[PDB]
Amino acid sequence: HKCDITLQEIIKTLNSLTEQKTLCTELTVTDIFAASKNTTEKETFCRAATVLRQFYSHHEKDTRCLGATAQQFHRHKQLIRFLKRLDRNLWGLAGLNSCPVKEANQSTLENFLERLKTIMREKYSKCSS
Known part of the structure; x- marks a missing residue:
């Protein structure tokens, strides 16, 4: 088939977070990238989207990076907000919605945005075919 508007749309938001990472990246999140066996991109989107x-x-x-500065706090609610925009939409761009597991390992949110964007660049x- 051909590229869809859904993805060209997401890369716009996923990109704004990288150019602007006021969400104090480097905070630690579920490490959904400990399987270099090359899992289907849609799959990384299902687990990744879950985190x-x-x-x-x-x-x-x-009280986690909430932003001691009442001003920085505005950035705290706005970025997470944009994250969630990505959580609900990421489910459509992914395709699956049932990847229950338990990655005891651990990664850094900064790497989740880097890793997560690495796959989207590939599918986009x-x-x-």
Whole structure:
């Protein structure tokens, strides 16, 4: 088939977070990247999407980087908010919605945005069979 608008749309948001990472990246999140066997991209989107989902909802109120500066706090609610925009949409761009596991390992949110964007660049630059 051909590239879809859903992805060209997501890379726009996923990109704004990288150019602007006021969410104090390097905070630690579920490491959904400990399987270099090359899992289907849609699969990394299913698990990966699961972590961004728990991250923006729980961080909303958890004195975790909330932003001692009432000003920085605005950035705290706005970034998580944009994260969730990515959690609900990422489920459509992924394709699956049932990847329950338990990655005891651990990674860094900064790496989740880097790793997560690494896959999207692959599916977006290859939306044709």
